[PDB]
Amino acid sequence: SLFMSLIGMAVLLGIAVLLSSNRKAINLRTVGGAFAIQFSLGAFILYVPWGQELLRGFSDAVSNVINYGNDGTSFLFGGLVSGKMFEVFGGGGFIFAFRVLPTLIFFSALISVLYYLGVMQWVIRILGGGLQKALGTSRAESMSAAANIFVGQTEAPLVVRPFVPKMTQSELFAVMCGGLASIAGGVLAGYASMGVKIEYLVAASFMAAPGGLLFAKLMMPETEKPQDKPANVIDAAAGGASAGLQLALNVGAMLIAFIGLIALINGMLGGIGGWFGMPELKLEMLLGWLFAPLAFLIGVPWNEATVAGEFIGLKTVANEFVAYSQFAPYLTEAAPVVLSEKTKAIISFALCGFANLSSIAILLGGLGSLAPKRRGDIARMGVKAVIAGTLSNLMAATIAGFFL
Amino acid sequence: SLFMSLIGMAVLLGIAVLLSSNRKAINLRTVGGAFAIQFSLGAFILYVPWGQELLRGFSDAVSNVINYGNDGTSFLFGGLVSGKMFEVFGGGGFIFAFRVLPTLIFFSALISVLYYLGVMQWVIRILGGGLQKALGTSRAESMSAAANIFVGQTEAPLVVRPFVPKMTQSELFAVMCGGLASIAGGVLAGYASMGVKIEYLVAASFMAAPGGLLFAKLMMPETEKPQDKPANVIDAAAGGASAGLQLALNVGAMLIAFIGLIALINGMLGGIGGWFGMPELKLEMLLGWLFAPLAFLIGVPWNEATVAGEFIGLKTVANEFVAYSQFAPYLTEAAPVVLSEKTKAIISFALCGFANLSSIAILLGGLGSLAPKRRGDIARMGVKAVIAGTLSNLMAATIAGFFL
Amino acid sequence: SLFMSLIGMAVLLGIAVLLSSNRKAINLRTVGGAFAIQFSLGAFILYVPWGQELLRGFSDAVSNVINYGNDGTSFLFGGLVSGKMFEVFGGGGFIFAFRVLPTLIFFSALISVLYYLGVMQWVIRILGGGLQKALGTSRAESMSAAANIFVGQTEAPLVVRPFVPKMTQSELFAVMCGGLASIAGGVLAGYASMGVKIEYLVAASFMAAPGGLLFAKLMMPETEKPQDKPANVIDAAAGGASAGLQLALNVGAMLIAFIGLIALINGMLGGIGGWFGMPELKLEMLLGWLFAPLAFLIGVPWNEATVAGEFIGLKTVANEFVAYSQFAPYLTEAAPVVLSEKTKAIISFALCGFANLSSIAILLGGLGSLAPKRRGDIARMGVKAVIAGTLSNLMAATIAGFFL
Numbered sequence A, B, C: 001s002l003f004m005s006l007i008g009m010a011v012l013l014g015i016a017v018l019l020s021s022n023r024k025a026i027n028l029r030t031v032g033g034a035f036a037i038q039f040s041l042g043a044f045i046l047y048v049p050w051g052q053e054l055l056r057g058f059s060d061a062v063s064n065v066i067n068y069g070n071d072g073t074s075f076l077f078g079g080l081v082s083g084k085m086f087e088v089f090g091g092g093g094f095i096f097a098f099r100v101l102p103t104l105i106f107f108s109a110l111i112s113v114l115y116y117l118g119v120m121q122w123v124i125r126i127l128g129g130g131l132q133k134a135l136g137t138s139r140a141e142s143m144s145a146a147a148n149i150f151v152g153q154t155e156a157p158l159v160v161r162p163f164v165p166k167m168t169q170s171e172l173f174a175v176m177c178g179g180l181a182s183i184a185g186g187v188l189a190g191y192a193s194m195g196v197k198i199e200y201l202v203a204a205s206f207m208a209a210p211g212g213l214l215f216a217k218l219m220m221p222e223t224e225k226p227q228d229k230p231a232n233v234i235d236a237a238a239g240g241a242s243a244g245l246q247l248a249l250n251v252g253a254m255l256i257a258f259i260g261l262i263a264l265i266n267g268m269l270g271g272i273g274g275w276f277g278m279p280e281l282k283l284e285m286l287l288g289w290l291f292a293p294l295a296f297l298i299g300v301p302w303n304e305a306t307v308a309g310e311f312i313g314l315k316t317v318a319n320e321f322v323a324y325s326q327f328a329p330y331l332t333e334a335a336p337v338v339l340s341e342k343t344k345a346i347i348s349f350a351l352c353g354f355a356n357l358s359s360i361a362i363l364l365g366g367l368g369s370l371a372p373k374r375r376g377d378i379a380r381m382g383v384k385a386v387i388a389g390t391l392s393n394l395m396a397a398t399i400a401g402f403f404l
């Protein structure tokens, strides 16, 4: 029972220690506090009544902002996003391209507005400062960690851009890990519109901050000594719309391509499996088979660990967006398999991160532009950082499965 | 009656004089002629029979080019832009993304073709030359003013690009003002497809040329001494399609974002107004309340000035595209309020300009690239130029309301 | 009969000889072998049983990859690409924007994956080497010719990019000609989805390799002496999706614009023809009238040569994509004219090339970036190279019409 989870946590921490660049330099105050905050944050918002109330309050607000944003998409696509669509096409009346993608545009505009107004900086400063006084992490790395709660891996470091070129390897690694452990407001709204529970997405975003520092500081302890805008609000909103347009277009093409490539891989796997008596072989069977142990380890019941493995595996080998798109159907009454409410929570939490190999190329471009002489360092540390981020998502799922 | 309008005109001119950089350097020939042409142009095409006939003749031609362009969108979107759409979804069968936006693509291609063929240059040279001999404005600023009738603020100066780096501050200011006072062929076709009357759009585009010079030369009189391509027609058309694609994508994302942000602002305003006994508070009430005087001043009947204020206010604080999108419904039998045909004309004319604060950032990039050392000057003069452009749109609306 | 074709071939070769930069330097081994391979390849796959079987086998595979890729578009557009669309809108239920364009995205991703895995390089090396040992063409120009079977004119030279800056004028010209004579995997899948027969598209792509060298070496014989990557497979797929997105967007805007401009040209032609007693005058009549001789010359029956001319003419003056879009309707039971199965094959083959004037601007940018000092040479040789490519497509159509 609750024992299989506390071992899950122990195993995750252990792997990080085994992979550390220097176990003897690990600061127990830093890593102990970091775990304590991620664990307590979970308990607070997933277990204690007052916590559950703040979480549901924040989630309902987010759900309202989303609905407000949909007035814009309704203006652009009209009847193609109305109730009439379900009467005519049934299930296929939900057009993903017009229901989900335009949300990334509206959220980016909104986030850009909140930065111009100083609202983001205000929230980041309080959370980032809380982390550093509690953990002894540097100022710049703590701010980047907090910013990553709300924005993507290449956007979050912008709040400390002048300090990036000269941060320590341990600081730069943490900055990467905070990005890989979290997601971003725009896609969060996307996943929600796909049916993923907002409470889970919000909780996982907040837990990514200490989670990312926890595993960065286990795997890459500090061995050095750290140191230490649009003309108006309308231009801010337009610049945000433009960046989100570009994001929406990219995510759309990636989904058409990746989902297409998986179908082709499955056609090939069936013909190849056939030579070995397994004509039914598919990419989902390999991944389920291969990741079931890990799913079991974080608290998925033995009889659901294999289906859970498919989703977790897909997020790791491809990205969380392709994974969520294959997981969303299991969140509706038309699911091929009815999963426990606890297994749904665990999958939702473990998928909630940008941790995958392709995020390295993105960090090289985006985070690299802030410190062009540190691109060698980013490439070198890329794989470890993806592992760090993966461990953080897994730890959050274990904690969540525990308190549920 | 016709008295409330002639005072409207007087007030608009007066504000410009009050804001001038040097009232004593204002050239009466220049500003008197400029007003005389804008006023007479209106009379000619809105009042005198032969004028009304040329205008309706030009508008019908434009309406035919639009219909021709729709064959291309029909090929791409098929049934989604057919009559069957209205039978199935009713009013929401009109999909804005496929009905309006593709028109920007076709018009840009067409404009690019007419430049390659020398047809644009020919028309610009006649109108621009007529202006300068009549007003004593410089050659380059007069050409830019005429070009702005047909193309956007960043495209119009291209006909005089080699002379821009060295124009006088008064010349550069006029170039900006001609851009802010007008629109462009692509979006004109958009507004028409939305239901805005072509006659009004065309008339306002032509009146923007003297109107923009009028207010530039009132607010920034000349105190210095002024001076003085695609390989084939198919590449021209393709380069124009490509630029219009980019424009269509940007306008679409801006609409999803801005309309979304207004709905969120309204949710917030309702909760905030509620603390003061006004739970019904919205952004449209603030703007209507705030701009009613101005609407009244240009000839909107007292009892329609508040609804007129909403649209005029929205165009000023955001842009004309968001404004037209909220005004278009009042042009159909399904309008929340039936407005006089005179109030519809006045709103249509006063919305017909790129004059807003966000157009400054666009001028900095586009007009700045032609004269990188004059970017400081553009930023400095930005706000005055937006005011100049606003006065020009307002003056055109007053003149139009008068002759109707 | 079969005589009218062998004269077609003779005429095509003759024009090339007449236009040569030096008929006395033409290498008979090179040009004789090149023609022998194009002709024999046709015979092999269009006539001999075993050949027809390999071709239909390769075409069916391609047809399966396409269907696999459509799972991705189905996820993004849902009901708008389902069988229900035809019940509601009938013929107009086929939305080109969602049926055809997303295929360019999936194919680009796939091609990018096959390069990362070394599968493309492997196939190119065998075919390119076969060509050079047989023809005595240089190594680099032979590889570029083979690569052009599968990828576009600006992508194919990438397999020999370090050698491009220093190739001979005859080599550079051949590189251009291989691009103009062929198409690319992405658009091939597009044309197929439009109804064009895959067997024809595949056969024409393979015949473009010797065909392009044949006419390059007739028109620009060698008079000089020739000489002689994404971090992982997921980044490869994403980079390919992104490039194909950009391509899909461009092709879409070009189609809206060009088809729109043709409708406007037709409105104007009707009014102008009217002054000469031909109110029915259209762009298709001019092109059919003007290209009928050429269509007749390649084996189109006298009574179908005029309709065939429309399509061939349109591909030459605009591009093959606009042409295929006007030709596709004649491939369905709802065709305005029922054409012989032989006339359909001939049109399909003669349209199958990037040979048009606009492809020069594209070669300047793409091929020019590989050798910035050779841009002058590319511009100078552009028109001859388009003629060379056109002759290659025409020759392939004649050969095909012969063996059918």
Ligand SMILES: CCCCCCCCCCO[C@@H]1O[C@H](CO)[C@@H](O[C@H]2O[C@@H](CO)[C@@H](O)[C@H](O)[C@@H]2O)[C@H](O)[C@H]1O
Pocket (backbone or CB within 6 Å): A283, A317, A318, A357, A360, A379, A380, A381, A382, A383, C231, C232, C233, C234
């Ligand atoms: C959708 C279903 C199909 C899923 C199956 C796909 C599995 C592919 C695994 C990725 O392969 C590796 O990825 C690394 C990450 O990019 C590369 O690191 C190389 O590149 C840099 C990446 O960080 C360096 O950090 C590394 O040290 C190293 O040099 C490495 O070469 C590459 O072989």
Ligand SMILES: CCCCCCCCCCO[C@@H]1O[C@H](CO)[C@@H](O[C@H]2O[C@@H](CO)[C@@H](O)[C@H](O)[C@@H]2O)[C@H](O)[C@H]1O
Pocket (backbone or CB within 6 Å): A231, A232, A233, A234, B283, B317, B318, B357, B360, B379, B380, B381, B382, B383
């Ligand atoms: C959709 C409904 C909501 C509507 C409400 C929004 C109202 C916002 C008003 C804009 O605020 C100002 O805009 C100026 C224009 O950009 C800025 O000028 C600054 O920036 C340059 C702009 O030109 C300079 O010209 C100026 O002198 C100045 O420095 C200025 O700082 C900024 O405060």
Ligand SMILES: CCCCCCCCCCO[C@@H]1O[C@H](CO)[C@@H](O[C@H]2O[C@@H](CO)[C@@H](O)[C@H](O)[C@@H]2O)[C@H](O)[C@H]1O
Pocket (backbone or CB within 6 Å): B231, B232, B233, B234, C283, C317, C318, C357, C360, C379, C380, C381, C382, C383
């Ligand atoms: C859709 C229905 C309508 C169809 C009718 C359109 C017909 C237009 C024909 C194109 O005109 C020529 O195209 C050349 C190719 O671009 C140009 O070459 C010029 O530009 C370079 C192109 O290669 C050089 O190679 C040339 O030598 C030359 O200087 C040339 O100037 C231009 O006049």
Ligand SMILES: O=c1ccn([C@@H]2O[C@H](CO)[C@@H](O)[C@H]2O)c(=O)[nH]1
Pocket (backbone or CB within 6 Å): A151, A152, A153, A154, A184, A186, A187, A319, A320, A321, A353, A354, A355, A356, A358, A359, A362
């Ligand atoms: O704001 C965002 C959204 C997405 N992604 C990338 O796109 C993938 C799919 O969401 C993620 O894993 C991440 O690599 C970002 O980098 N930033």
Ligand SMILES: O=c1ccn([C@@H]2O[C@H](CO)[C@@H](O)[C@H]2O)c(=O)[nH]1
Pocket (backbone or CB within 6 Å): B151, B152, B153, B154, B184, B186, B187, B319, B320, B321, B353, B354, B355, B356, B358, B359, B362
């Ligand atoms: O050709 C165009 C079309 C639009 N816009 C910008 O987009 C806004 C919305 O139409 C305008 O106010 C203007 O700022 C341009 O600058 N040029």
Ligand SMILES: O=c1ccn([C@@H]2O[C@H](CO)[C@@H](O)[C@H]2O)c(=O)[nH]1
Pocket (backbone or CB within 6 Å): C151, C152, C153, C154, C184, C186, C187, C319, C320, C321, C353, C354, C355, C356, C358, C359, C362
């Ligand atoms: O991969 C591609 C696809 C299209 N095109 C260009 O786009 C036109 C339309 O397909 C072609 O003739 C060619 O000029 C390319 O250059 N490369």
Ligand code: NA
Pocket (backbone or CB within 6 Å): A147, A148, A149, A150, A151, A152, A153, A156, A178, A179, A182, A183, A184
């Ligand atoms: Na983040």
Ligand code: NA
Pocket (backbone or CB within 6 Å): B147, B148, B149, B150, B151, B152, B153, B156, B178, B179, B182, B183, B184
């Ligand atoms: Na203009």
Ligand code: NA
Pocket (backbone or CB within 6 Å): C147, C148, C149, C150, C151, C152, C153, C156, C178, C179, C182, C183, C184
């Ligand atoms: Na090719």
